[PDB]
């Protein structure tokens, strides 16, 4: 990918870049999933051994406070601001807010809201005054790459994201193990109740939670499952990684072309009865200028 920016890249030291990041040593892990209920079109399989070079990865998704500092320093205008609208979950649109008649096929719970963007996540009249440490949302893949580049970083590949999110466990269902609520404790912010009609908020949140909510995984990463979907570097496909080759098994970058970029980790909207996509092997995609109230990102870096 060759992005275009209207801000200069500032000089930063290795110590500055590594703050808030964990060092993932080089090595192998078992990527992918073979849950019999996985949707074939998602390409969770095959399970395969992947070798990665050492890398750094953020413990936390990028926060509102951090994104605000980037915008302050650069004047960056997000894709949602250029388009003038972004996707908001229906239950979060305040009555009377102007909304477009737009229909996401098969997903009527998404509302295209004029003026929804990172600083006004439910549209005009909303703000982030009480969410400085929540993940920034309404950021597209382009916005994420712009932030990461300004920060001296990059987006993780899907393999890097998944190795870090798995937190040293071999082929567990979730970042922390195989039970969704071990010892009856919520470990991530997803949906409880009847999707898309009623979220009971049993885990504490019916929207985003602070980036440091819940226990971390074994590598010290927070909210890799749930909270917000997280953009990765790779172009999406369902089958590129079915090939057995060095390109797909050593520092894999994904296919060289595509139409949508990978997103990992699930969000506050995920539920077993509909998508079941908060398992660590799960994966989906979105087109790179798209944005939504449940999608953000975390950065990676070469050491």
């Amino acid at each position: 990918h060759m992005p275009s920016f209207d801000f200069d890249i500032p000089r930063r030291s290795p110590q500055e870049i590594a703050k808030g990041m964990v060092a993932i040593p080089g090595g192998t892990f078992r990527m992918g999933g073979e849950d019999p209920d996985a949707f074939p079109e998602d390409g969770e399989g095959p399970v395969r051994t992947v070798r990665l070079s050492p890398f750094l990865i953020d413990r936390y998704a990028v926060s509102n406070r951090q994104f605000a500092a980037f915008v302050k320093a650069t004047g960056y205008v997000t894709d949602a601001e250029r388009y003038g609208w972004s996707f908001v979950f229906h239950a979060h649109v305040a009555p009377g807010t102007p909304v477009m008649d737009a229909v996401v096929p098969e997903a009527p719970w998404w509302v295209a809201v004029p003026g929804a963007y990172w600083k006004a996540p439910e549209g005009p009249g909303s703000s982030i005054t009480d969410r400085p440490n929540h993940p920034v949302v309404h950021v597209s893949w382009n916005d994420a790459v712009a932030y990461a580049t300004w920060a001296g970083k990059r987006l993780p590949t899907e393999a890097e994201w998944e190795m870090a999110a798995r937190g040293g466990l071999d082929q567990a269902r979730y970042p922390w193990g195989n039970e969704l609520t071990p010892r009856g404790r919520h470990r991530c912010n997803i949906w409880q109740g009847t999707f898309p009609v009623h979220d009971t908020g049993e885990d504490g949140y019916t929207g985003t939670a602070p980036v440091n909510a819940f226990a971390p995984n074994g590598y010290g990463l927070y909210n890799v499952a749930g909270n917000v979907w997280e953009w990765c570097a790779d172009w999406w496909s369902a089958d590129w990684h079915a090939t057995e080759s060095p390109a797909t098994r050593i520092d894999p970058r994904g296919p060289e072309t595509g139409t949508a970029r990978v997103t990992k980790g699930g969000s506050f909207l995920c539920h077993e009865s509909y998508c079941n996509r908060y398992r660590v092997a799960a994966r989906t995609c979105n087109t790179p200028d798209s944005s939504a109230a449940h999608t953000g990102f975390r950065c990676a870096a070469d050491p």
């Binding site: 079109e41 477009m100 996401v104 096929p105 098969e106 997903a107 997103t263 699930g266 509909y274 979105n286």
Partner: peptide
């Protein structure tokens, strides 16, 4: 009925 949708795209509403 078809694959569940978690990523709503700007292209999808056209």
């Amino acid at each position: 009925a078809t694959t569940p949708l978690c990523g709503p795209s700007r292209a999808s509403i056209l």
